[PDB]
C-alpha cells in the first residue's frame, strides 16, 4: 500500500450580515464567515488536505476566479471536484479527520450533518469521516469570536492496483 | 491493511495558582493550565486524535459532565478509556506524534517522562510514541505566555484479519 | 507495513533587514524571517515532522548550537542530516505535505522551487512532496504580517524488510 498523508488549514473572519455555513450545514447564528460564496472553512481545509496527500498543489492553484467550469461553484462543488481529481490522479481515500475551532456557537448537534455532507461528496461511508469541535478557551481572535479555523487530515493510497 | 489518520488540537489558558501538568508530568512553574481536573493539554490532544482516527467523534462527545463512570477521572484515565474504546472498535495503534507549544518553561528534560506515561496508557512501546516542544517566538497569546497549545497525530489500523 | 505518522510546526517573526527564505527559496520582499541562519520556517517544520514520525524526538534535541559537526549548517544541511538519521533508524519516507501561512507575499510562483529543494534534500521524487500556501485573512499576528507559520506532515514506513 503506497500510503500518503495530507494536511489542510483554513480560517475565515466572522462578521455581521452573513450566514454561518460549516461542513455544508447552515448553523443559525448572529454572524457568519467572510469570503467568496459560502465561506465554508471546514470544506476548504479538507479540500486542501486531499490535494496535499496527492501532491496536487492546493485549492487556490486548482480553482481560479476566472475558471469557466466553476463559475457559481460553492464549497461542496469544489469538494466534489477535488475528489474527482484525486481519483483521476490514481488515489483512493482511506479516511478524513478534522477539527473546527469556534468559540461559539455549539457545533456538536450539527456534526453528524457535516459528516453526511462530506461522506457523500467524497464517496465514503460515514465510518471513514470524522469532524470534531473545539473552543479556543477565549484566547486570540478565535477566542474573541473574530474568526473560525478548520484543520484537516486525509490519508490516501495510490493505486497501486 | 486499513490504515487511518487522526489529528487533535488542544489549548488551555496559563494562569496563577494552578500546577503545570503536561503529558502527565508535573513541571515546576509559577503558572499552570486552567480547565476541569488537571487540564492536560497534551493528553487531551492525543485523545481527540485517537477518537478522530477511529471515527468515534471527539473527547467531549464521549466524556460528559453527567457520566457516572468518569467523575473523578483525570486525563490519564480518559486516555486509557479512549484506548480501550479504540481497541473495542477494532483498531490497533501504530504510533502517536505530537507538539507542545509553550514559550516557557523548557519541556525537553520532561519529554521522556511524558512519552513513558503515554506509551503505558496506550499499551505501546516507547518507540511508537513521540512528543516535541516549540516556543512561539514571542508571538501571540502563546508567545506572551497566556496559554499553551498541543497538536497531535495518530495512525491506527482497523483489524482486519 | 509498519506505517508511522509525523507532524511538525514552526513560526518565525517577519522583520525589516532580513531576506525572506522559505523552503530554501529566496523570495524578494521588504522583510524576512528572524532566527539563526536562514530562519527557514518550512524546512524546520518538515524536519520536526520527520523526526516525529521516526520517534527520534525533535529538531532542537538533535541539532545543538554547541555541536561541532553543524556550526554554520543552514536549514538545508539540517534537513539532509535529518533524512540521513531517519534512514539509519531503518525508516523510508512515503511523502511530505505542508502549508505555509503568510499574508504576503504571494508564494504560488515559488512553490515548485521549494518542492524541488525539499525532494532533493530528502531523496524523494517530486511526486511525494507537497507545499501549500494560505493567508490568515488579516487575523492575528500572521494576518498583520508580523510572522509566518509552517505546518508539516510526514508518513514513514519502518523496514520492515
Ligand atoms: N501567501 C500566500 C497565500 C495564499 N496563496 C495562494 O492563494 C490561494 C488562496 O489563499 P487564501 O484562501 O489564504 O486567500 C491559496 O490557496 C494559495 O494558492 C499564495 O500563493 N501565497
Ligand atoms: N466558492 C468558491 C470558494 C473558494 N474558491 C477558491 O478556493 C480557494 C480557498 O478558498 P478561501 O480563500 O475562501 O478559503 C480560494 O483561492 C478561492 O478562490 C473558489 O474558487 N470558489
Ligand atoms: N464550538 C464548539 C466547541 C466545542 N464543542 C464540544 O465541546 C467539547 C469540549 O470543547 P472544549 O475542549 O473547547 O471546551 C468539545 O469536545 C466538543 O465536543 C462544540 O460542540 N462546539
Ligand atoms: N478530567 C477531565 C478532563 C476533561 N474531560 C472532558 O474532556 C473534554 C476536553 O477537555 P478540555 O475542555 O479541558 O480541553 C472536556 O469537554 C471534558 O468534558 C473530562 O470529562 N474529565
Ligand atoms: N518550551 C519549550 C520550547 C522549546 N524547547 C526545545 O527548544 C528547541 C527549539 O525550540 P524553538 O525553535 O521554538 O526555539 C525545540 O526544538 C525543543 O527542542 C523546549 O524544550 N521547551
Ligand atoms: N541553521 C540552523 C537552524 C536551526 N537550528 C536548530 O533548529 C532548531 C529549530 O530552529 P528554530 O528555533 O530557528 O525554528 C533550534 O534548536 C535551532 O538550534 C540550528 O541548529 N541551525
Ligand atoms: Zn476558506
Ligand atoms: Zn484540554
Ligand atoms: Zn524555525
Author numbering:
A (entry chain A), B (entry chain C), C (entry chain B): 1 to 161
What does the paper say about this structure?
Surprisingly, a second molecule of CMP was observed in the active site when BcIspF was co-crystallized in the presence of 10 mM ligand. This second CMP is likely due to the high concentration used and represents an artifact of crystallization, unlikely to have physiological significance. The binding of CMP 2 within the three active sites of the asymmetric unit is very similar, for example the main chain conformation of the α2-α3 loop and the positions of Leu78 and His36 interacting with van der Waals forces on either side of the pyrimidine and helping to position it is essentially the same. In addition the position of Phe63 that helps to position Leu78 is also conserved. However, there are differences in the orientation of two side chains that change the detail of the hydrogen bonding interactions with CMP 2. In active site A two solvent mediated links are noted involving the carbonyl groups of Ser64, Phe70 and Ala73 and cytosine O2 and N3. Overlay with the EcIspF-product complex shows that CMP 2 binds in the same location as MEcPP and indeed exploits interactions with the same residues, the majority of which are conserved. The binding pose of CMP 2 offers clues about molecular features that might be considered for ligand design targeting this area of the active site. The unexpected observations that a second molecule of CMP can occupy the active site as well as the presence of citrate interacting with Zn2+ in BcIspF are noteworthy.
